[PDB]
Amino acid sequence: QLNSTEISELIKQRIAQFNVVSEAHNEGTIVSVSDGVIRIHGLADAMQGEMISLPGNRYAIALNLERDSVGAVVMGPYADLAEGMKVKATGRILEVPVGRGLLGRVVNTLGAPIDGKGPLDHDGFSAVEAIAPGVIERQSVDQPVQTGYKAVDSMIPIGRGQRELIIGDRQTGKTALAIDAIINQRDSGIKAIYVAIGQKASTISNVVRKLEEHGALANTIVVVATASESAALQYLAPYAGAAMGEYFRDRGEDALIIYDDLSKQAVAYRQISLLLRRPPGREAFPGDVFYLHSRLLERAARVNAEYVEAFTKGEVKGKTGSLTALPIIETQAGDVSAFVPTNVISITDGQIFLETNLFNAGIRPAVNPGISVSRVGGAAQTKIMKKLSGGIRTALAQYRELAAFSQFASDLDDATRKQLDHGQKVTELLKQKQYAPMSVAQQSLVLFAAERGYLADVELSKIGSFEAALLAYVDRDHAPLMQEINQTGGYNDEIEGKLKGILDSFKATQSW
Template sequence: MANIRSDEIKDILQKQLEGYEKETDISQVGTVIEVGDGIANAYGLKDAMASELVEFDSGLNGLILNLNENSVGIVVFGETRMIKEGDKVKTTGKILQTKVGPELLGRVVNPLAEPLDGKGEINASETANIEKIAPGIVYRKPVEVPLQSGVKAIDSMIPIGRGQRELIIGDRKTGKTALAVDTIINQKDNDVKCIYVAIGQKRSTVASLVETFEQYGAMEYTTVVAATASDPTPLQYIAPYAGCAIGEYYRDNGEDALIVYDDLSKHAVAYREMSLVLRRPPGREAYPGDIFYLHSRLLERAAKLNDDEGGGSLTALPIVETKAGDVSAYIPTNVISITDGQIYLKSDLFYSGVRPAVDVGISVSRVGGNAQIKAMKQIAGDLRLDLAQYREMESFAQFGAELDEATKAQLTRGEKLVELLKQGEHVPMSVYEQILQLFIGVNGYLDDIKTEDVEEFVSETVEFIKSKGEDALEKLKEKKKFDEELEKKLKDLIEEFKEAYSAKFEKEKEEEDNEEKTADEINTEEEKKETKKDEEEK
């Protein structure tokens, strides 16, 4: 019989006990003591962590936001009617996560990546924390590659680079969402994955946006994350972070992504509502003190990574709504100070028919100019100056003062440029077509064209250059800048077309005059006959 040594028994028992400890469920269980307005307070979770995910008996999930002395404040992802006092709640030891990956492209999901489009389950193999620390300066590189929006007014004067954070700001119904949607539609052949986050919008609005994306073939590279007005406030709060996590998947895998937050004003309101119910102290405009951190930690995650990190980028276009054009309100000033520039849409311009209603005076891009192609930079410098002078002269001319010829010429040029920069919804343009159109305007070829004929003249001129000046266009695409030879070639083509256009215009005018003359003659003959008939009757 083999001898049994006591130290061997001790080792075996110790190993078994260690294994038993690992298998034990270490989650804590607490009790709900109060529930309502999307918030539950629970007692007994003494080792709970901030931002930890918890599970209720009813199957709903929640997120711990408040750590009080004797209880924890939990925001509930679902209807709080399903939870009652005395229900059990247990910790999970996990931070809130969402599904990420290419499986989400073409889908409409809620912030927890649950499908809303009725197209079945999303079988994404990867998940990511919705809250993540933004990459540090060491891991970033300067913004160098343009993200073309396809909108003339933006790409020329307020350019956006990949990895930039550009705020779209303006009153309600001034075309903010339309601008962001056009930018997404324009990424079709640019290999940029897009995420559109709808916060606090009506379901019908989100449905019509998805329809627009499908109509223009944008859904195949876009994910729509929707937390609508009818959804619980906590879902609206986590929506932008979940969307950002989906975008970061592409950025961290060396791809380019674009995310639109529509809009952060409603996001701030959702957070304020939650904070007040959680009894956090209110500050300015009743927002809690950490409202700035709420948006800064979100927008700092947009970045252009360096080559060692894969060289991917995440570009953010947050949208903020102003009231009566007040850009000095709390949330607008917060987000302006976080972002790398803003596109300000003015309601006065919008209602006067200037669309997109970009106010060039207040709008600015602090880094996008570094990502502009040289040809656009050469054209856009003069354009911005001409428009700024026009706005000043326009306000001066309203007083009815007598104007000298130079001032009149500036007003004429500005009026034509404003007309040139008008662009319809969902018709984004390639950057080279934009450059050709702006070249025509900046060089004064529109000064003697009627304002109502500008659009027709410009589009016909561009088509003429494409057909007769293919070599010039190829040279522009190859060099991406203007030289003397290329400028001369383009000017010759424009002048050639303008001569033909003027001749055609004169001919049409002559025909119109003849028609009017003939009509007048017929009317005169008829009048004579009537007079003669009256005389005979008398």
């Protein structure tokens, strides 16, 4: 701590660098203060979206350039402002710290550290509001991003550069599903970004604690706008997350971003619109809310190697960057015909519908396979999974068509009883415990087991212990094959023979 010498020298470097000459600026005066909105009279040269600078290190986003006023929303505690204060119009747009140093930091939406573990070591700044890569810049998504859920990676693939909506009622596992997606990417080279809109701070601390108890936190950035922070910060926070993820995308790396509750960004934006007196639409949401999410989600993209080389000025070659988004939405009473669910259901590439009935009945994760979709689909899987999951799709489709008879089952004919029991066994197979992700080898093995009829005789209540025993058996006894599959995902008659051998040996030699 005799570093005080350094301290004082650092302050001396800040003193030396102050270019004490003046610059002309444009000025205005506050004439109103209410609920976080201020009305500024003057600022003839204000621009829309500009950061206006108030007394104290505070700013406001000028959103209404009315004929004779400027409506601006304060980015922070506004109760201190007062009529008649003077205000300056910088030329600046909202820019945020960005770069590799952020990984493992928790920051608010201005990028101020909030974990308290000191300042940032960022790599410069980036504009919060940017335009996504054009049509010509994209490249079709053909790589997997593994969630580690049997239920998702088989029937609802997610590809690098896709945008998959997690949607469901309250308390059905939307956050658990996304955080397991993050945890699974600890080793996978994908850098994750978790951005929490309007959650209570103790929940944020809880999830960060779970990410630190697993290995994942060192990989990932957390961006926080707690429910006590003003609406401007809540509403902006998803853009600050995307601007952090694009630093990685535009440099050939892969990133994953998880906007928690876009259905609360929409609410903060509604509040801001109604206080600015903008004409309300349906359910009082302002009309542009589609544009609001549309521009945000369109930034999730995969960019071909030539756009990277053009951006990084030749420094990175032959690599394609990618940003994957998993927004979360909450629907009241399963109702998917509301304004915000229907907008984001229209924008995204797929949906994971989480059902509260399935969640109660024990099926966890509660993904509803019959109405969940993914428009990147088969293109994004490993070809072993691509091969094996087609039969799960059909098994469940026939089960869903037959299910109506389950309440008269005893009257049915065995020619259909076979199907109506295979459906139940494969469904009991897709249940999974939390924080327990599976490598692709294990999901492929466990799906092969059910696809080739091995489970046709195991009793329903034991399927889970069967699965656990199988995964342990293969992990000790046949590890090189798992290594091969996990490393390449390939499929061959050779691999199929090895798998048939493993199942035969297990089903005789071991027990569950």
